[PDB]
């Protein structure tokens, strides 16, 4: 129904506990299933950016990825909820810089910014505590 492409940014939007992380995980697991099959340059290297999630969920996700063998191609950037708000703000950029290595060197990357609705709350925390004037829902400009 909604087919992705190879350089496409596709938003997984929904309410809580509807299966957004699940769609992203099936994308990463399917890329492990197809990387063992294609000649060396159609292989997709995944990056999971886990912003704002609890550390138990990231442990469950690393357990799942390593028991299915998908951790061989996956990087996981994990700025959890107890981390400082600049680490949660900066972890999508860290993960994108890790996954841009494969884009810049002829390979193919795939990145999931899981809970990008939490990077904005961490950025709002930083900008309100740096005394920058708030806006819509007190988010920065």
């Amino acid at each position: 129904l909604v087919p992705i492409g190879r350089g496409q940014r596709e938003l997984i939007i929904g309410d809580r506990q509807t299966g957004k992380t699940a769609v992203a995980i099936d994308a990463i697991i399917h890329q492990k299933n197809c990387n063992e099959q294609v000649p060396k340059a159609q292989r997709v290297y995944c990056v999971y950016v886990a912003v704002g999630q609890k550390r138990s969920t990231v442990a469950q996700l690393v357990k799942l990825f390593t028991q299915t063998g998908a951790m061989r191609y996956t990087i996981m950037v994990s700025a959890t909820a107890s981390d400082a708000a600049p680490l949660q703000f900066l972890a999508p950029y860290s993960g994108c810089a890790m996954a841009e290595y494969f884009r810049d060197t002829g390979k193919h990357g795939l990145i999931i910014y899981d809970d990008l609705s939490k990077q904005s709350v961490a950025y709002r925390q930083m900008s309100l505590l740096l005394r920058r004037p708030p806006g819509r829902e007190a988010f920065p400009g």
């Binding site: 959890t80 961490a122 925390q125």
Partner: protein, 365 residues
């Protein structure tokens, strides 16, 4: 690993993990203290380890009530037999200033963290209203000189709540089974303080105001409560399929809710009037009498085992109880007790016409 609580809507539709964070979301008078006292009654007795109760910004009446009901239960022993006590109370109740309510959850967590890390134990951490932690930081941050974020909360809401909630974990050397009550501030689940703490929980048990206005207690919303244990690879497919079937029937009745209002049930399809009657049955069958609610209702409590709920909810789904009335399912434990209430409703419509009771010759007795 699953933690059976003996509550039907909790066991079936959002089962509790034995070492995970558990939230009870409620809206001021829907029953999340009675639910947490029933979880203390059903869980903390069969648990062999230690319990901590962090009372964060709740009634001091309830703190004295829990203390006295724990002394007469033998869970707290006074004086010389104090070493055999199983529970630690930490109380920062709603008369305390906001600096005390904002740090008393950390006190309860520290007492539980000692038993987790040092003693190697399994701990239960009940926190009554973890919302009042957030609210107390919101009270003190108006004077700390910060620019406020959305609805009026501090700009550091999520990192405050996350730095508190990331300490309540099962580690490699101990487990904290934490049941937290969360207050939603104006029956608003989109308020930032409930919406922030949805992310740190394994099982959310969202209690509804309208379900309580129906009279169905505990007022757990079956289509707003979730769990990471509702998965066939942990609870088995026979439990998972009946839970997803019950949720499917309750959603397919919720989709008819305004057609039934503005037109009535008179015009619905006969494959959908079956759906409405079955869902009116399985939403009375989630009702359950509690052992802690028997003091103000009088009906005794019903602990229901898990296999009883799974078999009793297969039966209403397949159609094995389409002849029993709706009210036969209300406030009963098992599907067995539906049958002894269905026929007791049919004695008492026939016992109206049996006798004419008069009392004679007792003025000299």
């Amino acid at each position: 690993e699953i933690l059976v609580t003996g509550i039907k809507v909790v066991d079936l539709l959002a089962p509790y993990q034995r070492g995970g964070k558990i939230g009870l979301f409620g809206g001021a008078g829907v029953g999340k203290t009675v639910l947490i006292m029933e979880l203390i009654n059903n869980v903390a007795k069969a648990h062999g380890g230690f319990s901590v109760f962090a009372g964060v910004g709740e009634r001091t009446r309830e703190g004295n009530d829990l203390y006295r009901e724990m002394i007469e239960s033998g869970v707290i022993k006074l004086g010389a037999e104090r070493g055999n006590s199983k529970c630690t109370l930490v109380y920062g109740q709603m008369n305390e200033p906001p600096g005390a309510r904002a740090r008393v959850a950390l006190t309860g967590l520290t007492v539980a963290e000692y038993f987790r890390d040092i003693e190697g134990q399994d701990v239960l951490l009940f926190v009554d209203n973890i919302f009042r932690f957030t609210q107390a930081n919101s009270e003190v941050s108006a004077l700390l000189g910060r620019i406020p974020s959305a609805v009026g909360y501090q700009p550091t809401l999520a990192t405050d709540l996350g730095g508190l909630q990331e300490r309540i974990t099962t580690t490699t050397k101990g487990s904290i089974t934490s049941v937290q009550a969360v207050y939603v501030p104006a029956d608003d689940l989109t308020d930032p303080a409930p919406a922030t703490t949805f992310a740190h929980l394994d099982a959310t048990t969202v209690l509804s105001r309208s379900i309580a206005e129906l009279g169905i207690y505990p007022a757990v919303d079956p289509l707003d409560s979730t769990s990471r244990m509702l998965n066939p690879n942990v609870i088995g497919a026979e439990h998972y399929n009946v839970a997803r079937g019950v949720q499917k029937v309750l959603q397919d009745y919720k989709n008819l809710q305004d057609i039934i209002a503005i037109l009535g049930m008179d015009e619905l399809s006969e494959e959908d009037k079956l759906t409405v009657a079955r869902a009116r049955k399985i939403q009375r069958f989630l009702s359950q009498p509690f052992q802690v609610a028997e003091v103000f209702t009088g009906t005794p409590g019903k602990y229901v085992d898990l296999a009883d709920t799974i078999s009793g909810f297969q039966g209403v789904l397949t159609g094995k109880y389409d002849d029993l009335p709706e009210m036969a399912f209300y406030m009963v434990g098992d599907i067995k007790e539906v049958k002894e209430k269905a026929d007791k409703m049919a004695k008492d419509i026939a016992s109206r016409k049996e006798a004419d009771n008069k009392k004679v010759s007792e003025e000299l007795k």
